[PDB]
């Protein structure tokens, strides 16, 4: 948000100061890496998404939905890396697991979204940099589910 | 405005196009190299500031108030340059030269406003990008604040 930094530091009749300053250079720095992540992940959207579903296949019963959902959960994070933005994940995951424990297994569910994380990380094995970013915001999509 | 991209994806239940995704790229490399020259102003803004006084100080009659304005225009460019949007300034300086020609002069603030652009510039010798930004926004703000009452 950097219309944001701009109205707090407006109301306070002030220059942006340095980690205001220093937080937005990063933002857009690493632009170019969230975004180089994000199409991989979605040039491999369906190999990893089967990936997760045979990883639980047993404990599934609609399979048009779970890959349904699990391929929603992988785009809303490839929402979030893009916009550099953990809390698009935390926005749309909100009372999700509530949903899904009624209609499925929330267990089966989360090794899932395990499998999911393994999946993408492994795009990534000759760049340690771009692995933290999919870890971290990976992490925040199952800690979000999990509650 | 990547959170735009993102919005109406989002409303086809799809992931982002290599389109998206690349203009995406260009619009981050604008960002990053707009804060670079925000930095630039900022760390330097008393020296800015002092040389657009200095270029005028002999009409000045309220010397706190003065160098205050000053700092304030480069500010709200600043503002503008961060966010990539001149339209921070035209509704900032709107009628602002009415009400300045009253507490002293027009043509002396044009002047000290020049030179803002000058030593803003002068920081910007190795880039010629980064110059021709800086060089708009200033020329945005010198515009409307000549302009009509
Ligand atoms: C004259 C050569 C110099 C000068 C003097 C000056 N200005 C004022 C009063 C005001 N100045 C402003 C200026 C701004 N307000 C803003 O929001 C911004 C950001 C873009 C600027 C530059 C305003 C709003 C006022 C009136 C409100 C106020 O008084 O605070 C005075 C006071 C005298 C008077 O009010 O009649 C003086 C002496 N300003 C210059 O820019 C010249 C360098
Ligand atoms: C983060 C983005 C996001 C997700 C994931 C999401 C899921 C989601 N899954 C749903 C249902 C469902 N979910 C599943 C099952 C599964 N689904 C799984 O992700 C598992 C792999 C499996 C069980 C563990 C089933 C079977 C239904 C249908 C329930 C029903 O028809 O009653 C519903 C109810 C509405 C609907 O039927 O479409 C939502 C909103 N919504 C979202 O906005």
Redesign the interface.
Known sequence: L??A??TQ??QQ????GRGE?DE??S???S??KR?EI??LL?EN?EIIVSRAANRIFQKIENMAKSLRDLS?FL?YA??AI??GDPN?IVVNTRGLREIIENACSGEATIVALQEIKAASLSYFRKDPEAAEIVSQYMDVLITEFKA
């Open positions: 950097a219309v930094t701009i530091a407006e009749d002030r220059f942006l300053l937005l250079a933002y857009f720095a632009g170019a975004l994000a199409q979605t959207s929603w785009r490839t929402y893009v916009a698009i």
